[PDB]
């Protein structure tokens, strides 16, 4: 019984519907996510062979162990919906709200956050999972630990090496090859969205808002940003996908060296 294992509390947000909760077994804070079956586009199967939403499949593939990824702790099927029990860090703020309240982040802090997002996306790819909706809204900050957590795999897919022709993520983080041709490859599309994200951290908002800006290939910097960081951003936002860096090249980039540890990040920047 899902209704006997968890004390349900306040709506955290929707747009399915996510409630704050506590596991009765040990007072663990959880988030309880409800998704209507009728509104599910992609379906998959688990080892049991049970037909589940792809989001459930992808969450199980990445939830093994510790990571900068939200952990699926359990799920339930109901007549017209599935219910997901997820980790809930506390205290938490998502990265969109954090940037809204603080403005453009110092490069030292953006370096630490971006690095942690890179490690989490690498973890997804190692587990066979393509997130397809990397953005500040889908990143939680554990304000006490200084750790970032990637959330919302509802638009993701199994990672493959052949072309993708479907996409249901965030258009302003999608690459020009999707805007123009309705096609993209997984890793290079991920790298594009990471360039959008990095710009967003060091400038205080995403660079592009309209299709013509996405395909236009011009990055104007609205804040003071170091030349090394501008170079990395422009490299991630290369118009041709094959011109974009790999994850190894991002993490070897000179702007990325000497990152802060998560605990240092919390103490210097979040406490």
């Amino acid at each position: 019984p899902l209704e006997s294992q968890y004390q349900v509390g306040p709506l955290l947000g929707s747009g399915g519907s996510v409630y704050s909760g506590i596991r009765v077994s040990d007072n663990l804070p959880v988030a309880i996510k409800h998704v209507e079956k009728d509104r599910i586009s992609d379906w998959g199967e688990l080892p049991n062979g049970t037909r589940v939403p792809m989001e459930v499949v992808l969450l199980k593939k990445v939830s093994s162990g510790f990571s900068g990824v939200i952990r699926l702790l359990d799920w339930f099927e109901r007549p017209d919906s599935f219910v997901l029990i997820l980790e809930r860090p506390e205290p938490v703020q998502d990265l969109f709200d954090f940037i809204t309240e603080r403005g453009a982040l110092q490069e030292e802090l953006a370096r630490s956050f971006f690095w942690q997002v890179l490690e989490a996306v690498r973890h997804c790819h190692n587990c066979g999972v393509l997130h397809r909706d990397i953005k500040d809204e889908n990143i939680l900050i554990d304000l006490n630990r200084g750790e970032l957590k990637l959330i919302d795999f509802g638009s993701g897919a199994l990672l493959k090496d052949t072309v993708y022709t479907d996409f249901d993520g965030t258009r302003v983080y999608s690459p020009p090859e999707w805007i123009r041709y309705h096609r993209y490859h997984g890793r290079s599309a991920a790298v594009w969205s990471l360039g959008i994200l990095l710009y967003d951290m060091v400038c205080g908002d995403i660079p592009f808002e309209h299709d013509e800006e996405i395909i236009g290939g011009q990055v104007f910097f609205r804040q003071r940003v170091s030349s090394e960081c501008q170079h990395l951003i422009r490299w991630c936002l290369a118009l041709r996908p094959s011109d974009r860096p790999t994850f190894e090249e991002i993490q070897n980039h000179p702007w990325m060296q000497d990152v802060l540890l998560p605990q240092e990040t919390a103490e210097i920047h979040l406490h």
């Binding site: 809204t100 809204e137 638009s155 993520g169 965030t170 258009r171 205080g204 908002d205």
Partner: peptide, 9 residues
Amino acid sequence: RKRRRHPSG
């Protein structure tokens, strides 16, 4: 200038 969220889809 207006900074806003963007829905997925």
